[PDB]
Amino acid sequence: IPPGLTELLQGYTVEVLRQQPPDLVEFAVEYFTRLRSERVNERVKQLAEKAKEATDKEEVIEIVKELAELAKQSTDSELVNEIVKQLAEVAKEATDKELVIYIVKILAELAKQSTDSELVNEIVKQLAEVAKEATDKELVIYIVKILAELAKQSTDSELVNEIVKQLEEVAKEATDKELVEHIEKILEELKK
Amino acid sequence: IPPGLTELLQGYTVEVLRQQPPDLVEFAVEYFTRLRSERVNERVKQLAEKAKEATDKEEVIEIVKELAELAKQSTDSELVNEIVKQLAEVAKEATDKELVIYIVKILAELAKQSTDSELVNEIVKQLAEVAKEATDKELVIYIVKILAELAKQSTDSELVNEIVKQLEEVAKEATDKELVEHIEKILEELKK
C-alpha cells in the first residue's frame, strides 16, 4: 500500500458519513478537488514566502520555474490568477533584469495561450505595471509590443480597448521622448 | 455506511495499486472525474434513446427538462456540447411546435450565458438549422432575432461574422418574401 492511502480514504469516509451526500461520485469529485486546491494554494503561498526570503537570484529563478509550471498545468482560473499575482510580486522585487524579463515572458505566454478573458485582462494589467515601473526603454518597448501583439491577435474589442488604455498610461509615465512617440505610434495603429 | 461506498473505494484502490500514482489526491480527482463523466455520458445517451422511442410529447418534455438541467449544472464543455446535439435531434423530430419553441429557448439561454466561444458558435449553428427547417415565419423570425441578440451582445467579431453568415443562409432558404426582406434588414444592421 502506498503511503497515505488509508488516511486519505478515511478522511473522505468521515465526510460521507457526516454530510450524507445523495451521490458519492459527485461528492468525491468535490471532496478531492477541494483537497487538491487547498494543497496547491498552500504550495503557492510557501513559494511566495520563500521567494521573498531568498537572498540569491538562483533560488528565486527556481521558484519562478515551479510557479510557471504549476500555472501551465492547472485548469483552475482562480489558481492561475493567484500565481500571476505572485509572479508579479517577484518581478517587482527583482533587481536582476534577466529575472524580470523571464517573468514578463512567462506572463506573455500564459496570456497568449489563454481562452479566459478575465485572466488575459489581469495579465495585461500586470505587464503594464512592469512597464510603468521600468527605467530601461528597451524593456518598456518590449512589453508594449507584447501588449500590441495580444491586441492584434484578439477579436475581442473589449480587450483591445483595455490594452489601448493601458498603453496610453504607459506612454504618460515613460520619460524618454522618442520612446513615448514610439508608444503613441503603436497606439494609433491599434485604434485603427 | 451508505450503499456503494465500499465498492467505490475498492475501485479507486485497485487503480492506485495498479498505476502507482505519485500523487494520490491528483489521481483521485482524475479517477472520480472519469467515473462521473462516464455515468453522466451514459445518462444522456439513455435519455436520447428514450426521447426517440417516446410516443407522447409529455414524456419528451420531461426528458428535455432533465437534459436542460444537466447542461446547466455541468462545467464540462464536452458534455454540454453533446447535450446540445441531443436537444437539436429532439427539436428536429418534434412535431409539436410548443416543444420546438421550448428547445430553442433552452439553447438560447445556454448560449447567452456561456463564456465558451466554441459552445456558443455550435449553438448558433443549431439554432440556424431549426430556422432553416421551420415552415412557420413566426418561428423563423424569432430565431433570427435570438441570433441578432447574441451578435449585438458579443464583443467577439468572429462570432458576429459567423452569425451574419448563418442569417444569410436562413434568408436564402426562407420562402416568404416579406420574411426574407426582414431578415436582410436585420442582417445589414449587424454588418454595420
UniProtKB/Swiss-Prot annotation, chains A, B:
Phosphorylated by the activated catalytic chain. It comes from the Eukaryota. Four types of regulatory chains are found: I-alpha, I-beta, II-alpha, and II-beta. Their expression varies among tissues and is in some cases constitutive and in others inducible. It is found in: Cytoplasm; Cell membrane. Regulatory subunit of the cAMP-dependent protein kinases involved in cAMP signaling in cells. Type II regulatory chains mediate membrane association by binding to anchoring proteins, including the MAP2 kinase. The inactive form of the enzyme is composed of two regulatory chains and two catalytic chains. Activation by cAMP produces two active catalytic monomers and a regulatory dimer that binds four cAMP molecules. Interacts with AKAP4 and CBFA2T3. Interacts with the phosphorylated form of PJA2. Interacts with MYRIP. This interaction may link PKA to components of the exocytosis machinery, thus facilitating exocytosis, including insulin release. Forms a complex composed of PRKAR2A, GSK3B and GSKIP through GSKIP interaction; facilitates PKA-induced phosphorylation and regulates GSK3B activity. Belongs to the cAMP-dependent kinase regulatory chain family. This is cAMP-dependent protein kinase type II-alpha regulatory subunit. The gene is PRKAR2A.
